[PDB]
Enzyme design. Structure first.
Site, PDB file in Angstrom:
ATOM      1  N   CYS A   1      53.784 142.349  48.786  1.00  0.00           N
ATOM      2  CA  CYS A   1      53.937 143.669  48.087  1.00  0.00           C
ATOM      3  C   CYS A   1      55.378 143.840  47.744  1.00  0.00           C
ATOM      4  CB  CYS A   1      53.467 144.758  49.007  1.00  0.00           C
ATOM      5  SG  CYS A   1      52.966 146.281  48.319  1.00  0.00           S
TER       6      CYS A   1
ATOM      7  N   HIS B   1      43.832 145.019  44.483  1.00  0.00           N
ATOM      8  CA  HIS B   1      45.063 145.239  45.145  1.00  0.00           C
ATOM      9  C   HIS B   1      45.709 146.513  44.481  1.00  0.00           C
ATOM     10  CE1 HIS B   1      49.081 143.987  46.974  1.00  0.00           C
ATOM     11  NE2 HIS B   1      49.421 144.815  46.034  1.00  0.00           N
ATOM     12  N   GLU B   2      45.747 146.527  43.143  1.00  0.00           N
ATOM     13  CA  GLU B   2      46.371 147.663  42.435  1.00  0.00           C
ATOM     14  C   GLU B   2      45.588 148.980  42.571  1.00  0.00           C
ATOM     15  OE1 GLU B   2      49.410 147.050  41.928  1.00  0.00           O
ATOM     16  OE2 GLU B   2      49.287 144.834  41.763  1.00  0.00           O
TER      17      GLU B   2
ATOM     18  N   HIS C   1      46.434 150.767  45.695  1.00  0.00           N
ATOM     19  CA  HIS C   1      47.597 151.581  45.683  1.00  0.00           C
ATOM     20  C   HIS C   1      47.351 153.007  45.232  1.00  0.00           C
ATOM     21  CE1 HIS C   1      50.740 148.892  46.943  1.00  0.00           C
ATOM     22  NE2 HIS C   1      50.515 148.051  45.969  1.00  0.00           N
TER      23      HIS C   1
HETATM   24  O1  BB4 Z   1      52.780 144.816  45.244  1.00  0.00           O
HETATM   25  C1  BB4 Z   1      52.294 144.273  44.233  1.00  0.00           C
HETATM   26  C2  BB4 Z   1      52.776 142.904  43.743  1.00  0.00           C
HETATM   27  C3  BB4 Z   1      52.586 141.768  44.732  1.00  0.00           C
HETATM   28  C4  BB4 Z   1      53.587 141.156  45.390  1.00  0.00           C
HETATM   29  N1  BB4 Z   1      53.088 140.152  46.207  1.00  0.00           N
HETATM   30  C5  BB4 Z   1      51.731 140.068  45.993  1.00  0.00           C
HETATM   31  C6  BB4 Z   1      50.800 139.171  46.478  1.00  0.00           C
HETATM   32  C7  BB4 Z   1      49.477 139.320  46.072  1.00  0.00           C
HETATM   33  C8  BB4 Z   1      49.138 140.347  45.199  1.00  0.00           C
HETATM   34 BR1  BB4 Z   1      47.282 140.528  44.666  1.00  0.00          BR
HETATM   35  C9  BB4 Z   1      50.036 141.219  44.681  1.00  0.00           C
HETATM   36  C10 BB4 Z   1      51.377 141.071  45.044  1.00  0.00           C
HETATM   37  N2  BB4 Z   1      51.472 144.924  43.349  1.00  0.00           N
HETATM   38  O2  BB4 Z   1      51.111 146.120  43.785  1.00  0.00           O
HETATM   39 ZN    ZN Z   2      51.078 146.050  45.766  1.00  0.00          ZN
END
Ligand code: BB4
Ligand code: ZN
Ligand code: ZN
Ligand code: ZN
Ligand code: ZN
Ligand code: ZN
Ligand code: ZN
Ligand code: ZN
Ligand code: ZN
EC number: 3.5.1.88
Length: 203
Positions: A130, A173-174, A177
């Site tokens: 992240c 993943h997004e 958030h």
């Molecule tokens: O935080 C991030 C970017 C990010 C950084 N390292 C990662 C590893 C896997 C994935 Br899926 C996304 C990311 N997008 O919110």
């Molecule tokens: Zn992320």
């Protein structure tokens, strides 16, 4: 406000605009955006996609102090709105030829959601990370293998889309958030590399 800083014509997003682990914004449920979009929300979307393109571009990434990344969510900029950008590149072949499609997925999504998904789970072999987390975090982040999403583009047009593979992982993943969910929330608490039978491990 943060938004006012980011939407300045000359301003390029960089790591100094990304909030850190512990900031309460990362744990909120982001607010739905209303259409027609304001100028600020349209520009914000565009600046977020530009950040991803820059993070992928060896020159710009070096100039601005970024590393390659594939997705970004508005909460990470301290903006509690349901706005995500995704930019998942395809790779060159062994001969160095560019792929027929530069990207497997390239979108700025407003109000995105999972509406259905596979029973099958999947995880990146390499774990996740992240932009907001400056700690090493091991383990399989267990996600849905396949998802069907709905979202709106900046024009207000609704899309319904099935995703699999990496695309599926990134979008999940997004979306997490904008729901105040962190990747490590989905790592097994006692054995980070536990594998429940049938988990699809993506290399
Ligand atoms: O935080 C991030 C970017 C990010 C950084 N390292 C990662 C590893 C896997 C994935 Br899926 C996304 C990311 N997008 O919110
Ligand atoms: Zn992320
Ligand atoms: Zn900045
Ligand atoms: Zn525009
Ligand atoms: Zn540029
Ligand atoms: Zn479900
Ligand atoms: Zn789910
Ligand atoms: Zn629907
Ligand atoms: Zn934990």
């Amino acid at each position: 406000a943060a938004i006012d800083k980011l939407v300045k014509a000359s301003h390029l997003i960089d790591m100094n605009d990304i909030i850190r682990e512990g900031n309460p914004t990362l744990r909120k449920v982001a607010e739905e955006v209303t259409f027609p979009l304001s100028e600020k929300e349209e520009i914000l979307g565009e600046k977020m996609m530009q950040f991803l393109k820059h993070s992928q571009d060896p020159i710009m990434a070096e100039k601005l102090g970024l590393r390659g990344g594939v997705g970004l969510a508005a909460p990470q900029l301290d903006i509690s709105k349901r706005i995500i950008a995704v930019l998942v590149p395809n790779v060159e072949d062994a001969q160095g030829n560019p792929p027929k499609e530069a990207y497997s997925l390239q979108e700025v999504m407003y109000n995105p959601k999972v509406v259905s998904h596979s029973v099958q789970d999947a995880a990146l072999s390499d774990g996740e990370g992240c932009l907001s987390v400056d700690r090493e975090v091991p383990g399989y982040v267990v996600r849905h293998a396949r998802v069907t999403i709905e979202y709106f583009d900046k024009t207000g047009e609704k899309h319904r889309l099935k995703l699999k593979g990496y695309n599926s992982i990134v979008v999940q993943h997004e979306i997490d958030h904008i729901d105040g969910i962190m990747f490590y929330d989905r790592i097994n608490e006692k054995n980070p590399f536990a594998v429940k039978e049938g988990l699809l491990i993506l290399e």
